[PDB]
Amino acid sequence: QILPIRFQEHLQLQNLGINPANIGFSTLTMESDKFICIREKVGEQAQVVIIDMNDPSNPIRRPISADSAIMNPASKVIALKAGKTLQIFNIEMKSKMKAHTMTDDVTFWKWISLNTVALVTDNAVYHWSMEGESQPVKMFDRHSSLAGCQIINYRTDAKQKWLLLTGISAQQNRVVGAMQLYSVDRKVSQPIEGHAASFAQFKMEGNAEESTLFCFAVRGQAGGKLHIIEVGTPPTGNQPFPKKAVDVFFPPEAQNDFPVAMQISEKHDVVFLITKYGYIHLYDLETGTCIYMNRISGETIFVTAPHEATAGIIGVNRKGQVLSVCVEEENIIPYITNVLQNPDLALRMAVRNNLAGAEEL
């Protein structure tokens, strides 16, 4: 049978000498699809294992004194932190690029662009750009609802004027996500119950310029729900994006699941959603319509990234399989019109994203 998405296996890290207690959210980071960095405990010389994804047979192992190591999303430039000490290193030049010591402990950090690491302490969120002697500037202060939570994500939009911090707490058999959405233009935040999110740029039809869309999924309490909403005032000449709110189905076998990860393709205008028990969901970004729903992994996929070559999502599970799911481009429109029995959505995604299969009217 002809399916709307395509699966690929890239690596299994256990074949390169990675012990799976170090395959986890604490010790493995994958900021983009170019590199994987594994904090490793061998003997007790604490080392880091850096996998080039364009050369996976030759990883490099170097000793560290850091509690977290994140790779730059484009270059082989590592960021290492110990408590309040932060350092930025070029690996191919063996040079320290930058260094800064904060007043507080940085509990979470993530590259948000090509040259900016974002820094999360217990009370504030900082943006540290790598240009020159640029020191971390403060974006916003943290909200009451994210205190005492495990911070799992921080995502911005492309203009970096809409920021979102995402943490989780354990409230009675159930992982409750708390998100702080902050705008730097109105200097105001909002607490949202939310589990996984991403931002997107989306030019509507009949329209001059792109909407900036905020998409998040929650297993809140009514159930699983997915919301797609425009943030900010629309530009002038731009009709506003109509608010989308659809259901996220969870099966009765997996009624302790919740979403953990989200990437949005802009080549196809779709939303990839992965849950904790290893389920992939594919939605349409314009309408919210569920295209596909099935289970990619037996184990927990804890880290994801955009897949740039296929316009998809790449993720690592707890066993160590590096997997990728993308839109199968010659199959998705015949899947929507005949298996999903939706000729209208198949017509719309064939005109909007230049997909084949628009000769069956």
Binding site: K81, F89, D141, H143, S189, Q190, I229, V231, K243
Partner: peptide
């Protein structure tokens, strides 16, 4: 400051309305 590698409270308002 030795190298970490060896190579050798806010304003709350409504930004978005989520009620359909």
């Amino acid at each position: 400051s030795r190298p970490l590698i060896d190579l050798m409270s806010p304003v709350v308002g409504q930004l978005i309305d989520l009620s359909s």
